[PDB]
Design a protein that fits this description.
Chain A: This is Interferon-activable protein 202. The structure is a homodimer. Helix content of chain A is 6%, strand content 42%. By secondary structure, chain A is mainly β. The first copy, chain A, has two domains: 106 residues, Nucleic acid-binding proteins (OB fold (Dihydrolipoamide Acetyltransferase, E2P), Beta Barrel); 89 residues, OB fold (Dihydrolipoamide Acetyltransferase, E2P), CATH 2.40.50.140. In chain A, the strands form two sheets. The first copy, chain A, has an eight-stranded mixed β-sheet. A five-stranded mixed barrel of chain A has the order 9-10-11-13-12. The two termini of chain A are 34 Å apart. The chains hardly touch. The structure holds a DNA duplex.
Chain lengths: 195, 192
DNA sequence: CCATCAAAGATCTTTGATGG
DNA sequence: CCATCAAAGATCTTTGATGG
């Protein structure tokens, strides 16, 4: 089945414009690489997790593609081996509204992130106040104008590309509210990179 | 701070442990318990030349020793002699019994953080961690966690056994009282 | 009934208070 | 201005709730 549990299959074809995509990366040892992308329709942007590396080229910025038999997990799309992805016909193309492009690249305030439900996937670019390397984890204190929060990565550390002073790019991190002590924690598909 | 007592005191030796390594690069130490006519004292001995002197029921006269909040500490600068008969005496039965008794855990929990704790307790559970070994000990009223993080070698006691503790430190932090190993801590046990 | 992953809690490391 | 050492704080593990 889908890499995201509970994800629902959508057979109906949908045409999107690719806004951005990450390099592929190893998310789990012994498994094929994945990448993250953001795509948009005339009315909505979607975060997308792509598990078929045949599709690297099709996820080029500003390209229009038609996707079918993809999975939807709480608004996050998953494209795996069973999906069909083709280049869109010129007649299937459209203009993405500016507000949608803007929202797709925006990062929520940390204070607002903290109000979301536990388990919500968090994406964004944040200033780093401190980085701490431990044996079983790397932690970051990230911050903005108004607030700060801890980011916890407990996965393989070798391939993280982050340099002192960089802003931190987060993809698919999980909000954990704990009990008034919230953090962002890596999960199965999380990706982290300096900007 | 510990108080130096230059004047001689004659005591009877009640019990003493075998010597053990308490700190890397240091001479061994042992624990003992001794008594006068009127009081018992727990004792820490750091001069191993004195081990034969600390045999059960022996009367010894101690001088230039330290009293550290009720615990006597005997190092190289102390003088320890065999007592003269005229300094010998009878240790009353209630003093000997008090020397051997263990505080209820419910009373231990009320003491100040940092108080040194000794006693014999039933073991309820043992857990081995990466860098510590912990035990749950109990009596008829209460239970408490013991933490050993000094050497990470096997402590071969488990549920049903009895654990004898020497100079463990009470920590109350977080409203969660524990007994924690410290500089001079030692564990003996009775296998089941 | 395993797998998941967040909440709860234990363990481990750092800080800070105290004294000599 | 070392040495202790317990609390605070951070990391790490265990537990418990959910869902295919």
């Amino acid at each position: 089945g889908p890499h995201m549990k509970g994800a629902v299959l959508h057979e109906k074809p949908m045409t999107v414009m690719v806004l951005t995509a990450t390099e592929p990366f190893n998310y789990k040892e012994g498994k094929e690489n994945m990448f993250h992308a953001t795509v948009a329709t005339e009315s909505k942007y979607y975060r997308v997790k792509v598990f078929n590396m045949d599709l690297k080229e099709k996820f080029t910025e500003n390209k229009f593609i038609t996707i079918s038999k993809y999975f939807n997990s709480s608004g996050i799309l998953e494209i795996n081996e069973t999906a069909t992805v083709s280049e869109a016909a010129p007649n299937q193309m459209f203009e993405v509204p500016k507000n949608i492009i803007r929202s797709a690249k925006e990062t929520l305030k940390i204070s607002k992130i903290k109000e979301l439900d536990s388990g919500t996937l968090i994406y964004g670019v944040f200033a780093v106040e401190k980085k701490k390397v431990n044996d079983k984890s790397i932690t970051f204190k990230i911050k903005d104008n108004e607030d700060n929060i801890k980011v916890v990565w407990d996965k393989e550390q070798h391939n993280i590309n982050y340099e002192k002073g960089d802003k931190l790019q987060l993809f698919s991190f999980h909000l954990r509210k704990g009990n008034g002590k919230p953090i962002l924690h890596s999960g199965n598909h999380s990706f982290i990179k300096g900007e």
